[model samples]
Structure formats: structure tokens, C-alpha cells
Target: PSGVEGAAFQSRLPHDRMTSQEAACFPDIISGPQQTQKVFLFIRNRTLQLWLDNPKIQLTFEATLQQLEAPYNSDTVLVHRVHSYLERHGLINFGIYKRIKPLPTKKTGKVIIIGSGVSGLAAARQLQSFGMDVTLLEARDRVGGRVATFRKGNYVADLGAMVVTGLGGNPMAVVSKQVNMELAKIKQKCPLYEANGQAVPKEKDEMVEQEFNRLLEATSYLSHQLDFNVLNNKPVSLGQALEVVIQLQEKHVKDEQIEHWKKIVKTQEELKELLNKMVNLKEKIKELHQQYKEASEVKPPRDITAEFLVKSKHRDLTALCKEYDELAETQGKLEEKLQELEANPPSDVYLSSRDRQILDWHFANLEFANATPLSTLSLKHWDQDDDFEFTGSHLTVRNGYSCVPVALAEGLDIKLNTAVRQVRYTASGCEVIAVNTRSTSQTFIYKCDAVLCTLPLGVLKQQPPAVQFVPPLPEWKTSAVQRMGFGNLNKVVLCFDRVFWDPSVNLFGHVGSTTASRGELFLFWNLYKAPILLALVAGEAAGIMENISDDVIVGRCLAILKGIFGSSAVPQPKETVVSRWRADPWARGSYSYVAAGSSGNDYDLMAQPITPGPSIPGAPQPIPRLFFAGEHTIRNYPATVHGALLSGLREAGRIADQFLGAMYTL
Candidate 1:
């Protein structure tokens, strides 16, 4: 019963492909019945009539259809006696279907949301729809804070938060359906390539990936067993936990150096081959630089009349200059490694160089998922949402993540470029001092009962604090903010003239040759409804990219691509959209993470509301005057769009619950 789908009578002879037609098609009905009537109305899923031609049920169905046909054109008479006949004949009982009759709810509360990110929009829309007067004060000219989409003619690319991590039960999935926005399920067909443009042997690739999964599996497994941290009273980190588990997982192997001459000889062969590939890679980079310079000199930005063309070339030239310098510096490292390997042979078995390379590459992928490197990830509380994370296939918004926030913002009052500087909440209510982000010098004081701040955790952890709290946040809240980690993840999105990598694969990884370059630009991602390639710069690499210029970052992305897909296969992007989320003042970082000395408890503490009474009428209950909602505030689902969305819905329900007649359901 629970597995069945669709409306009543839609299935007959479950496997039957044919739909029921007029009674004339039924042998029993046509032969027995004296009357001849040809009807064009579709008799769906009633194939039983094809044989039984049961006059009783068939007559009942025919009578029900007669009431709705054009001749009768029944009005306000949906419940015909035809169904009563079936009920009396023991054909079926009335399946209970609750009919909803909604009454107008009272608009009784006033709330203010600090930002217009997905979380802010979710809360604002939910609250406003639940009869609360909602206001959104955004610091940017646009609504979506981190979900930025760059549009050029028919091309579309999301610079931030592109993929919907998990589709099942995701709030964005429901909203996408509501707004008719499309979603493309990312195919699970990611391929990994080494620096020499060689695909990692599928067997080695599968083994390392499966081993990585086991490492995570055992990480939590041993974490629970060694739940021994309490006795020692020392905080454990994800890196340390995984390291301990690694020793057990390995049958027996010392991975520090090469001991035997045979292993050493094999390693040298690989190193020599890799070195040759590196030199070849170096020449190709030089060629790319030469091409760039000539291309820049040939047409230059000034010669281009169109503003976009001029802007594009100027960026290209700047990136070209940075690329030229970076190439010179990077080339030295590989040569140094080769020279050292030839001179001094070490003494432990580093069985396969590719093994370590792929393992490091996989670790980098883990960092992207957490938005924080494994070194500092909370041992006890990382992946807090694994049990409850939306199930099923992950999907990418066919349009952009911005469609979500924009859809939520419709018909709501929003003040763009109005950054809030101070929030003062007291017994009576709260007053917000919103200042102009532009040169206009506009400042306004707004008084509202409930102030819902969806400001990112990164913004809250600022040195001086982005928004000053009236009496300042309490010690408990401040401690939670300081203890929690705000992660930095950036993206270099490029739209090429055409696809270079395989179009069928949504993701590809590059196994960097050196430790210094590991995870530098490991992820090459796509499926943006264009020939768009997104290079995810996470972990340490993301931080480095944040301080550098966009031109240089794009250059770094291209260099990584050239290493994996070969120089000629890669081309100058028609458009480049690099995201420096860490540098965004309004954002400060990509998202939040649970770090050392902090657990899921910090998230709950961050979500707690400030002093306020429940906002019920008569014996008037004062709803929370100050509340918080964002990905960081949710314990189970942190660092995801759904987490932020659910957080907003949560506070909305909370705020409305006290003010509305009953528990306000999300």
C-alpha cells in the first residue's frame, strides 16, 4: 500500500500497457448488452471491463462519467450516487481523504533578517507567509550573498555553491519543484588523471577510493570506540583519528622511504619517467604563455571597442603575466626532486608513487566536503549530519542557485546595499542601525520585535565583528562563535569555446606530482548548462587564492588543467568567473565547520534565541526578539544549502509557533 503511486484506478493488470477504451472494446459488455452506445470518453485502468464487462461496476462508472460530460456539465455535484452503488455492492469502501479548508491566519509578528542569502530568504519567506511582517536588509546590490551566477548570453555559471549536495528531501528540491526550476542529476562518473595526462589505472583508482571510504568508515567506528577522549580529557582531531586507523588498516608497510634496491630501482624508473613528463609539461606551459602574449599584443584591450571584449582581454593579459611568473617558479621544484632522487637513494618501501599521490588527492577531496582540512576537523563531531543528510542522488540546479533566493524574495520588502552595523535588542524590542554600503551616506533606524540575523558565522567571527551587538554577544555565544571554524573555499569557473574534458563525466581530479601542489586545484567540475568548467580550490589552496588577484588564480586553474588534459587540449576560456568567497566582507568565508575543542553543541548554542517573551495575543506572549538562522546554526546539516534552508524554516516555525494559534508546522 505504501509503495503504490499515482491516483485511483491508474493501474490495471499492473503490467498491461493498454488503457481501457469504450465498452465496445469489451467482449462481455458488447455481447450481453442490448443497447448500442459509442462513447469517446477514456475509461482508464478499467481493463477488468475488457473481460468481465461487469454491468454493475461498469454502469456505476458510466453514470459517474455522465454527470461530468458536456451534456450534463455537472456543477457542484462531484459526489454522485454512482460511487454509493459501488459502496453498497461491496466493490469498495470510501477511502478517507481529508479535505483542507484554510482560514486566513492573523499577521501578528514583526521580524528582520540581516542577510538575503538562501537562509535569510527561507526564513523571510516562511515567516512572512506565516503572517509575520518580514524585512530583509542586504549589504550587496543583489540578494544572493554567496550564490552568485554569472550570465553571458546563453551561457550560465554559478561562481559559488553550485551543486545541490543531496536531492532527497532537500528544501531546494521542493522549492525548485514549486518554482518550476530545473535540476540536473550529476552522473557518478568522475575520472582521475595524473600530471602526465594519464588516467590512473582503474584498478588502482578503485582500490584507493574504496580504501578512502573505509578510512572514513573506520574513523567514526574508532572514534566511537575510543570515545576514550573523555578519560584522557584531551581533544582528538580528525587527522589523528584517521592516522591511527590507517596503521591498523594497512596489513604491514613502513611508508617513509625506499629500503630495498629493487623497490628503489623501480621508484627511480617512475621518477625518471615523471621527470621527463614534467619537462614536457614545462615546455607546453611556455608555449601557452607565448600564445597568450602574442594574442594580447595582436588585439590588446584598447583596440577592442566593445566593453565586454576590452574587459575580457585586459583580464587575459593580467593573468598571462601572472602565469609567466608562476611557471618559472614552479618549474624549479620538479627538477630539484628528480636531482635529489638520483643522488641519494632512501631506505623504506614507498611501493608505488601513484598510491601516495592518489591517497593525498583523495584527502584533498575530503577537505572540500568539510570545507576544512582534516588536520583541524573535529574528531568527535565531524559529519554530524551523515545520518540525516538528504538521501538519494545529488543534483545541480539547471539554472543557478540564485533562482532559489530570488524566488523567495518575491513580494517581500528588501533594502539592498543596506548593511546593518548595530543590532540593539532589549525588553521592549530591537532596533537595528542599517548604514549605506555606497557613498550615499544613508543610515536608518528600524525597530522590530524579532530580529532574525542570518549573518554568516564567518562574519560573526570577524576581528572587530561585522555587526556590533548592542550589549555585545554573551560570553557563551561568543565562545561558541570563536570555537567554531569558518572555512574558506573558492572557485575558478571557466566557460570554454567547447568542451576539452569528457562531457559525460561531471567531475575529474588531478593528482599533483608534489606535496606543495597537492589539492592545489584537485577538482575539475562541470554540468553548468554550458561548456563551463569549474576548478574547486579548497583547503590551503583556497586560502592562497583568496589573497591573490583573479588573473593569477585563473592562470593557476589553467595550469592544472594543462597538466591533466594536456596543453593543446586546453584553451583560453571565453569567460572566467573566479570566486574569492574568503575575501568577501559580507561572507568572510565559504561556510562553517566544527573544529578542535568544538562539537555539535556549539551549533546549538549559536542557534539559541536572546531574551524575549512568546508573542501570543491577550496574555500577550513575546516571541523571541533576537534569533539566528544559517548553515552554521544547524547541528545536523552544516555547510550545505539544505542546512541553511532548514535553519531558516526552523526559526520561522519557532517565531510563528509562539505567535500563531498552535504549533506552526514547517
Candidate 2:
């Protein structure tokens, strides 16, 4: 009970047992088509028994507050709503639920954290628990970074991160529970209507459910195969690794496993194809490297804005997007056809004219559909089921995770709006020159036993760079830093005053054949009572978003909604919030990923602490007294908040263990 007393009230509730108040709170506790039929039968068979029994009681705020403190206050409607919502959804019965411990922290030494996203916040929390001195530097005024939410008159809308994915090995659940947050369930339903030319079609709208299913199956297979390969090898070239998958496909055995086998095989084929298309990236980088070297040598006082010198070579970004778009179109069409193929197989088609007509229609329209192979298609024969329910999963803190930085910074001595211009390490120790933003133009020289530099490599690469190490980073480390690819990820959040479309429909599939974009954002959730739709744009899609205006993005979304549902169903969004992670001065990109041929080894060098002294007599370690810890530092779960938190804890633990004269291992 004391392990995580912070979340005692939330963790102790009899979430599995339903009470009368809860039943009354939700009369349609099981309000589905099948549930209605079952209820009718139950009423017919057990009317007297149902009437005589007392309804279960609902767990109110007052009750929860009696057990816990302010975090579980009586006015916390969000807390009660979460508990009742999960109970209604039956997520309480999940086998994997467990109590989580609070994040570890430290109490001494100035620890600097860069970025305030999930990874940064998690790291900060862990460092705080261990009692380490933490200085959280955020480029943005508010925290939560990508996991941002905005409030309207009476509704709170999550503009980013709608789902805490309840898949295999997701660490968000662990982090949420440890932080004393509660979890709630949101329904995943999407009602699709027939449409054409971005308008409702005249026909009785055939819902192409099969295509979506087929696409999901293919995606699952691809993701699973990717994970399997990564777990085995350190991080091999996706090309060479995928070849092994091709061999697996040759070992065809039984019909029962064909579906599973086909998925893995097809994914390997796709991976190979992707690798082949990326043939020019290395050559282009070599050319840019030469240009950058020449530019650096020509200028005495080197101008280090890497972007300015490498603009010509960066066209690969645009080319990659176009290539991805084409591939997605091809995949989308295939999925659509595959759905019809599964529903009416060759065996069934041979026996009936109707089946033949369906097959012909699929083939005829296939070429005309979205030319992207990445598109989602509803498959007829496949079955869909939730892998796991998140009703009893977990949520973040009440004041939002931004509270982390404030809590950690409470006792620390620090300078606001102060940027480290340069760092020099000598036999004595580390000396850092930091510039303050005050009108007086104050500069502070700080010397310490060690220093932790957490700025992204991009900012470090800028001319008159934000930070410079004394002896300069090693050649391989520099290359690794240069090659470490960071992607621009953006989110478009739409907040509607009222529920626009029927709550029964939760997701919308790929739009019309001519929509140009392969992204599907039909997934919606009514967060904190406000109807919000989150659009996920990654890779090239994210780049396109960079150029598009906010108005256009909102209009495009509205147009799609109107096309699917009638104009009446389109609710007027009170506001729209867009996140431009790439444009942020501090966080050049949302997260980091490996480029072709880049392995996890590069990350090790990137995260290696730059300690000066004992080994080398004259020369100081380039990043001496400097420590790097963030999402980019961890290989296993890079780009995730959990990874960042873990990295921060890992770094802090290392320092603590070294001082305490004990070896540390993770």
C-alpha cells in the first residue's frame, strides 16, 4: 500500500465490481446492437429477479477523497468520470493491471534537461525522485510539448496524443501509474457513408469495411516483423535483414498459418523496396559533406549554420515524400482489392455471378483508387478485435505533466533565458560561458565538477552555435551526430462545440480516389466532454503540413467531414491548434529515428558522456563534463517519452553510483 501511496485511492477501488450508482449513471451499461438483443432475452427470462435485486452503487468523489488527498478531491469530476467510464467498458478485468511505483529522482548536482516533451518530463520526474538538482530548460512557454490539450468554454480537448496505445510493451501505462494518474476509456467507432467528389454520394452508400480490415492486418504484420528483426540483431541494414524474411516466405506449409506468413513476407518485400528507393541518400550526403568541409576551411571564423550550406542536398526530403506518397497510393489500392478478394475468394467467385461482379468491380476500380499502397482498406474475410482495453490503463497528473519541471525547479538555483554560448574543459575542471537575456547583457562564468548539456544536435550545429565544446567532438561522433535523422512530426487538433457526427462511428477510412493525401484521421475522441479530432501526419506528410496554412488544414478537414457526413453533421470547431515541432528553435524535430545503414551503435556514441582529465594529459574531452540524456540517448525505445525518462534516470543513476563508489548497470 505504501509503495505508491500517491495513487492509493485510484488503485484500491473495486474497479472490477460494479455498483448500483454506476448502473444508474449509465443505464445503457452495455449499449450495443448485440447487447440490446441480449438484454431483451434477459428481461424475458429474469424479469422478477432483475427487479428484486438492488442496483450497484457508484463510487463518487466524496468516497474517493476519503481515501486519498487533494489529487482525488470531491470536485475532481474528471477522476470520477474516468473511474465510471472504465467500469462501464469492463477494462477492470484485464489480467495485466499492476500498481506502479513513482519515478526515481536525485537530490544534488545541477542536472540540465533539454526539451519538455514526454521524454524530458519523465526524465525530470525520475531525477527528482532520486533527489538530483534539476534544471529543466523548455523552449516553449508551456510544457506537455506534443501531448498538448486546450480548453474551450466547458470542454477540454486533447489537441495531440489521443491514444496511449495499449499494445505490446507500451511504457506509457507504467509512467502514468507511477505518476499517480488514472486512466479512462474512449470508444473507437467510425461510421462511414458513401461519398464522391468530396460530397455525399447519391447511392445508398456501401460501407467498404473489408478494405480497412485488410490494411490493418497488413500493418500489424509489418510492425510485428520489424520488431522481431530488431530484437534479434543489434540494428542491421533493413535491406539485408528483410532478405531473411523473404526466405521465411519460401517455407510455405499450411493454410492456417498462410495469413500470418503472408503478412511477414509482404512486409519484408516492402522493406526491401523501400531500401532500394533510398539508394541516393548516401551519395547526396557525401556531396554535402564535401561542400560543408570546403565552406568551413574557406571561412576563418567558421559560420556553422549547417542548414544554409546543405540546402541543395536536403532536396532528398521532398523526393522522399513524393516517393512515399506514390508507395502509399499503390498499397492503398492493393488493400482495397485484397478486401474484395478475401470476402469472395476465387472458390466462391467460380460458383456465382454476383461474386464475379464484385471481383470485377474491385479490379476495375483498383487502378483508379488512391495510388498509395499504404492506404487502409476494409477486408471482408478478416475479423477485428481490440488487442487490449485501456479502460483501467492510466492517465497523467491533474495539473498536466508540465508540473514536473516546476516541481523539480522549485529548490534549484538557476538563470532564466540564459543560453550556454561555449564550454571549455581543462585539467582543473569545466568552465561554461552563459549569456543572460537581460538588457544589461550579463555573462556568467560557472565552474563545476561536471556539466550536463542537453540541447539537440541541430541547435548545436547552428553557426555561432548555441553550444561549443573545448577540444571538439571526435570525427566518428560528429558523423554519428550528423547522420542521426530527426523527423518533423505535427498534429492538427480540431475542437467542436458539440458532437458533430454520430458517436457510433469512431474512425473514417481513406478518402476519395482524388484526395491526394493518404492520411486518415477519422479516429475521434470526446476528451473531457469536448469532441476533438486528432490528425496524425508523419514523414513527408509532416513536411507538407509545414507549408500549408492553418486555415487550409482546418478547411480541408471540414470538407472531408462534410463529404462523409451531411453538412448538418459537420460541427463548427470553436478553435484549432497546430504544433510545428520542426519550426521550434530548441527542438528541431519531434523525435529521432535511424536513417538507412545507421545502427544503434551511433546512438551509443551520441549518448556517451564527455568526461575530461585522467586519460589525456593536455587535450580535454570535447564534451568534457557534458552528459547527453534524452529520447535520442536510448536505442530500445527512442522517440518515446518512456525512453527519455529512462535515459534521464540512467544518467542520474550512473553519476550517483560513481560518486557512491558502486558499479551501475541497466
Candidate 3:
């Protein structure tokens, strides 16, 4: 009897996993096999059978359609399912549901969050804390706005904004800790300088120490001359700054005359080469300056000590020598000491660099792309449209980062596959027209006190503009929407059959030759236990990749690896998958960011609430009715998961304050 019961239980597992038993608990028209059949019919009608292959997608689609609209159809079903699934499992809500209850309102005011990225998620979570009924509407199926991770077998790879920094002890770090997500060490574990061709002779520990001391001494002299308070009184150009700093260093060195040259000269050949390099140092600096002026970005010097080889022609250096001659000071010979460091030091060079802000050049490039243009560009053509002049990437969090929306939507009813057509505001709240893309051919008039829209900005830019307002958005608001633009970002996930690199190390990061073609494929990074490489493409590079075929992308990526590591680096993968955030109709692009001159005020307009109607019996008053949250709306920490979550909290708190007349602290 025991064996028979065990067998029965074992056999029921698959059925339970595949069946729609959970859907049976909902309302009359929205529940049971009927709703399931309708959904299946709609998917089939649209020829979207691919969705059925994924159980998660199917579950989320059913939930969204049943909760929001009646009678789903083919056209609207998949998108709704995608949005819902992304929300439930994304990173934005990792720690949001812990010990938290949804808003408990006698009359739940409707809320909308725009841009389902970090700011949007933050807003949703915050509002829920205040007991307001909130609906997070996303144009994309996936939730993470910019930071996303892709899985390959057992491993995971990041596709966007991979690092969490600058918050210090802020909300982001706090939430991440609560969620049990471990951040990697501050310094990147990857090797810093790659000896691509010939190996440069490694300096002894003592010699390295001497170089470090010299660097510090030089830097100290430079700093004393660069008092910002004096700069305000008399601004100096870059050249002047360099001259003053160099002069100070020369004066200190001459006064100390610690010319331990004899001590350092272990070999005649080495001493001669060093002296020659120092004599030519000024020329090297000039060349570097010219290169910085021309190239949009500069590559690291091939030789670390190349800077010392340049000769100086500055008047300050000459003036320093004259001053030293007048002082009549004699320098002492330096004492020499020798100690060897292990060829491969136990210390992690990457981490040390981070502690010292010595990040890879790629990081600088990323910052450049995110901020204003570099200073070298002339003013005459500053505003002239140069495609490469401005850097912007499409932003979207990966699968795990999108979960904040799901937790926020738990109590409030959500309608999947229901494409909102129009919104008409009345005295009570608003009337939302939506069509279900299922077999039932159902339409819905959502009567609520307000509507919270958390859709991507790109969807608004699409043809036929999604959900027109009845009275229309105010002119200023509409203009602001037009002015704020969204960027295109694509993630190309390439899966391999097996790992070819070292198994002990999770990442294989490399900075390709600076002479190589300029492209988004800057760093070739992969994680252990994961057989997939997620190539992050943003802005123009992303747009270009969007037009290329998937096969081409895979081929190019493989070719790049082969070029770097020869045949050994290329591995056969069981399957390869890629995300098309750029092409997806509902998403169009990724998350939101401001173009230069765009303001945070634009997000305010996007978050403005739409009032509801008196005709609707369930509608509540318009106070704090419509609310918006998303990365773009956030004032601080805007482009992160914590930012989104906080925005949700802020909106919720405001609603709570207005309705309950009580103040809640985070």
C-alpha cells in the first residue's frame, strides 16, 4: 500500500507542473478551462505557438489576461505574458516582498509607474507599503531596465550595467544584502596588463618600490601647485598646470639630489637605456598630448615606463635648475637594496587597482558614453551631430532584475494580453479601453480612480502612439515626452557546449589591442559554470547589431575569440540564444535616459496622475490618484534597481500621507 501511494504521488508531479489547476481559483469569466482554452485559441490565431513551449510564459499570460481584460486574442496575448513573466522573476524586486504587506486601503487609489526599470520598481514597492492599489504597466515583456544577467547551463553572465557602485551604505547595497546577492570583490579579478607579444623583463621588488616612491614624490609636488582656491582667482590651462607640477617635482629632486643612479645601474646596458628614455620624455609627452587631441579616446601606453622617456622643454623645468644652482645644494648618493617579489604575486593586482581607482580603460569609455563629450573637441562643431560624439546605450535590467513589478502587482488585478487602446478621464477616475487577444474576443472598460502606467518610453515613440488620453496630455507634457529619447540596447547571449578556459576562474576578461577596430566588443568576458557569453551592444553599435542576422552575430563573436585565443578558445555549444530588446514591438528599445539638456522634470510629467469618474461605482477620490515610478523619475540613484524600488516607496508614501493622513518612514 505504501509503495502504491508513493508511485501515485510520483506520477502526479508532471501533471501538476504542466496543468492549469492554479487558474481555476479566479472569477467566473476569467477562471477554469474556459479561460485557458481562450488563451490557447488566441495564441494559435496569431500563430504564436512558440510561447506554448515555455511553461513560465504560459502561466504569466493567463494571469495577466484573466486579471485585466476579458476575452483575450492573438495580437495582444504574448506581449502581456512577456511583461508579466519578466516582472515576477526580475532583479528589481529581489528583497521587496520580505515582511511587507500590500497596501490596505478602504478605497484603493490607482497608481501608474512609467519605465519598469529601477526607479519604477522602487516606486511600486513604496506605494504598496502605503496600502494603495497600484498597477505597473510595462511596454516590454522583460523587467530589468538596464542590468540583466543571462544564464548558460549553470553559469550566469551580465549583459548591462553589471556593477553596483557609488551607493556606499545606501538603499541599493542594503537591499542587495537582504536578498543574499553577493557582489564580487571591489577590484576586478581579471588581469590588468596583458603581455600580448614579447614579455617585458619584470622589475625587482626594490626597483618597483623605488618607482612607486618616485611617483609619490612627483605627485606630491604636483598637488601643492594645484590649489583649487587659487585656480578660481586665476584659472590655468592644462599646459600651465603640467608645467607647474613638473617644475615642483624637478625642484624637489634637485634639492634632494638623491641621484641613486649608481645604485640603480646594476647593468651598463640597462643604465644607458634608462638615461636615453628619460632624455626623450618630453617628446613622448608631446606625442601623447597630440594623440589625446585627435583620438576620441586613448589607449593605454604599450610600455608602462614610456612616460619617463619623454624629454621636457617647459620653462619651469629650466627655471628650477637655475634656482637649484643658486641654492648651491649638494645631493647625496642613494643607498641600494635588493629583494625579489614572486613572479606571480599572491596579491590581486585587479583589486589593488580598484582601491587606487586604476580601472581598465573600458570603464573610462563607458563613463564617457554616459556623460558629456570629452574636452578635446573644438567648440565650433560642438553641437554638430556626430554619431560617435555622444554615447548612449539602451537600458534594461535582465530577467532576475525585473521582479519588483511582480511583487508590486500581487494584490492589484493585472490583465495580460490586454492592449490598452485609450484612456478617458472622468470625475471618479478614468475609463481604460482594452482588447484581450484571446479566443474569447473580449473587450474591457477598466473603471478605476486612476491608472499607473510604467511602460517603456520607446513604446510611446512608436507609430499610432499607445493609449491616447481623452482630453490629451497637456502641451508642455507632450513636448517633454517628445524631447526625452530612448536608446537601443541589445544582448547577444552565446552558449557553448563546454568550458575551454581555466575551470577555477569564473571570468576570462581581455582588453583587445587598442589598434583594433572601434566597436562594442571591447571586453571579452565570461563566467565559470556558465557556458554562455552575453555580448552587450548599445547605442549605434547595438543598432547595427539589431540589423544583423543572429547567425552573423554568433559567427562574428566566435571569430573574435578565435582571433584572440586561436582554435582552443572556440567551443561548441549545445544551444545559443539571444535577446532582441531592440526589435520587440512592445519594447521598441530598452529603458529611459535623458539626452543632454533634458530635465528630471520630464519624468514628473510622465508620472502625473489621470483622474477617475463618478459613473464608476468602485472609483475613489482623486487625491494622490495617479503616481509614477521608474529609473528616469528617480532624483538620485536613478539608473539602478534600488532607485526604482525607492521611487515606488516614495509614491506609495505620498499616497499614504494624503489618504491616511499618516507619515511612514522607510
Give the per-residue lDDT digits (tens) of candidate 1, residues 1-666: 112211122111122222232121333334433332122112222212221222212234334455344433342122233232222221221111111323236667677789998888877766665557889999999987878877787678788777776654454544554564578888887888787767888898998888788778888877687573432665778888877777654424443342434555665666567666556666666776565555556553454445555456567656665654565555566556556666665544433577767887888888888777787788877776566755568888778777777776777899998999999987678999988889648788998887888899988998877789986878899999999989878777787888787888899887777644565778888786678887887676778766778788788778878877777798898888878788889999999888977989999998998874333435565445789989999887787877787787767766765555331111
TM for candidate 2 is: 0.52
Tens digit of lDDT per residue, candidate 2, span 352-440?
23222222223222311211111221121011213223244333233333333343334333455656666776545666776654442
| Candidate number achieving the greatest TM-score relative to the actual structure | 1
Worst 10 residues of 2 by lDDT: 374-383
Every candidate's CA RMSD: 27.2, 29.7, 23.8
| Superior candidate under TM-score, 1 versus 3 | 1
TM-score, each model?
0.68, 0.52, 0.51
For model 1, the stretches where C-alpha displacement exceeds 4 angstroms are: 1-107, 228-234, 245-251, 254-351, 612-623, 660-666
Q: What ranges in model 3 sit over 4 Å off?
A: 1-128, 135-162, 180-182, 186-364, 367-412, 437-441, 502-517, 600-625, 663-666
Q: What local distance difference test score does each model get?
A: 0.68, 0.47, 0.45
Q: Which candidate, 1 or 2, has the higher TM-score?
A: 1
TM-score of candidate 1 versus the correct structure, residues matched by position: 0.68
